Every structure is written in C-alpha cells, then in structure tokens.
Amino acid sequence: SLVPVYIYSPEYVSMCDSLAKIPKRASMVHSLIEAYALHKQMRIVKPKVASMEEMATFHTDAYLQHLQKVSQEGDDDHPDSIEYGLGYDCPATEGIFDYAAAIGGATITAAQCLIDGMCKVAINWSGGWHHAKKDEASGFCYLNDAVLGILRLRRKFERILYVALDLHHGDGVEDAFSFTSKVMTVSLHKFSPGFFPGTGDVSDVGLGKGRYYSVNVPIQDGIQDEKYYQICESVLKEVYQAFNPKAVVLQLGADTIAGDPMCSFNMTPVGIGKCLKYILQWQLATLILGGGGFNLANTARCWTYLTGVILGKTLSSEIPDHEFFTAYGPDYVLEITPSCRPDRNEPHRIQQILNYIKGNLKHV
C-alpha cells in the first residue's frame, strides 16, 4: 500500500523496444533498474492491453481504424497516412497499433492501481507519449497514453494535475483538456520558434471553462539543475495552492538531460529528482511516466535514479554489471555531467513568466 507499483512484463518491454525512434531503450531502462535490484522493492504489475473501447474514449474511430490498418503489414507508404500525422516522426512500423495499445493499457493499468488504493505511486517508464491528438499521431506518439491514464483517473479523482517535464510541450494532453477545469496541465518545456511542437507559450492558458487551467513555462536552451528546480518549485507551489489536486500524472521525459543529441537543456537526473521529490511530498496518488530521451544510456541512468528517488534509496555510483553494461563506458558511473555551454535563460524573463503564471492562477 506504500510500496510503488511497477508496470512490467518481459513481453511488454519487448514491444516497447520496437518503437522506431527509441529502439532497445525500454530493455536498457528496465535492465538497469533490475541491476540495482530496485524491482525487488516494488510491486511488479503486468499491464493489461487497452481495449478498442478504452482507446476510443479519446481517439476517434477513423484514426484508430487507420492506425490499425497500416499497422497490420507495416504499410509506411499508405497515401492517407499524412492526414493522420503518420510519416517521418511517426512511421507506420508493423505492429505499432498493438505496441501503442500495450503502452496505453499499461498507463491505464497504473491508473487503475492508483484508484484501487494498491499504491500511492505507479510507474510506466514506457509511457508518456503526450503529443498524440485524438485524430493524429505526433512527435513519436501514436496513442496518447497520458490522456488515457488521466481519463481513467477521472473515475475517482475530480481534480487531476498533469505535470510534463519533457523537453517538448505536452500539447496533446493540454489539447485534450483545454476546455475543462477537472484537469490542470502544467508543462515545462523548450519554447522557441521552429522547435517542436511550436506551442505552449506562457500566454496559452486553455479555452472556455478551461481557461487558466492550462499552465505553460516556456524555457530557453541551456538551463541547469538549480535554476530549473527554482522555476518548477515556484510554479508547482502556486498550482498546488490554487488547484488543490487529488491526483498527479507526472511525465518525466529525459530529453532535457545533458548528453541528449537534441542538445537543448543541460539538466542532470538530480535536478529532475528534486522536482519529483517536491511532487511526492504532496503524498497524492501519483502516476509516473517516461517520454522522450534519445541518449539511451543516459535515459536509463535518469529513470533508474528517479526510481531510487521514489523508493527513497541512495544508489551506488558505479553502474552494476548487466546485459547492457558496455553501453555505459568508459567511466561506468550513474552520474551525468552537464555540458559547458551557456544558459540562455535570463532571470528577468524567468521572473516575468513566473508572475504571469501567478496572475493566471488567481482566476482559479
């Protein structure tokens, strides 16, 4: 009941390994967690596959049927695919519908675990694909498992907070709940013209009855642990005080970590860990999700460290022997060292963004 649920099965991880943009990442992530024996301190729960009905609670039938169609053989040359956002970012690799349904079902399973009181924390490190819209794939996302998980949590919880610490704006989740006040979305992300997905300015606050229940923290290149936590803590403080969430869905994309090929933010898992800690302190039902992360070893280093944070365990600095040990050479340590490049975030711009958010939350 105080032991975290860990969504895992060998067959699930294998399916997640087949995602075109992150091959073998799921295995590496689970393998490192196992090498630190953290799984022995968690309740391993095998994920159910998301039914068509569960998927259609957010995704349109036309899009679902298309995804299912091209997924059968692997038709990544189907002419109608561009309408549904399939193509370069989201290729129609065969089985992708079933793979996406497994991840969708995995996040739903985690949510159900939280509803039933089995745990206060549930983890799906292979979820967090928060870009996908109701009728189109987007940003390596085919099904929006985060939205599916949130819709599941809505069975018990009347006020759900979504926090995305991914490098990219969680536009799909924000879109899904743009018009409602039951769910508040909070996204910290890089915001710069031409940078995916191009949305999520501090002025974007949702629409209609959902106005001011969308929160965006636009951030520039090169932010590091200290400044990032200061921003995050001060935003989450106001949000908690104003929104009074009953449940939290936390997306922890590792594409902000130094050494990611995207080379934008300059974070270490320790900085993200402090953000996670601040949220965990609320002692609310918390769904933990992964996301982006394209330095695979570093992404495993990050989420392994974060699992330790969840368990309150200090981990050994040395990477333990396991299947992918050689991927962590030549230093073989868990810690990540930041790059020596500039922080483009002026403190005055940061402060104004902050105060602008403070003002918006007053209406809440």
């Binding site: 956002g85 970012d89 940078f195 997905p197 191009g198």
Partner: peptide
C-alpha cells in the same frame, strides 16, 4: 505542424 525528429 512541426517535425520533432
């Protein structure tokens, strides 16, 4: 529409 990626 943007490219990610």
């Amino acid at each position: 529409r943007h490219k990610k990626x």
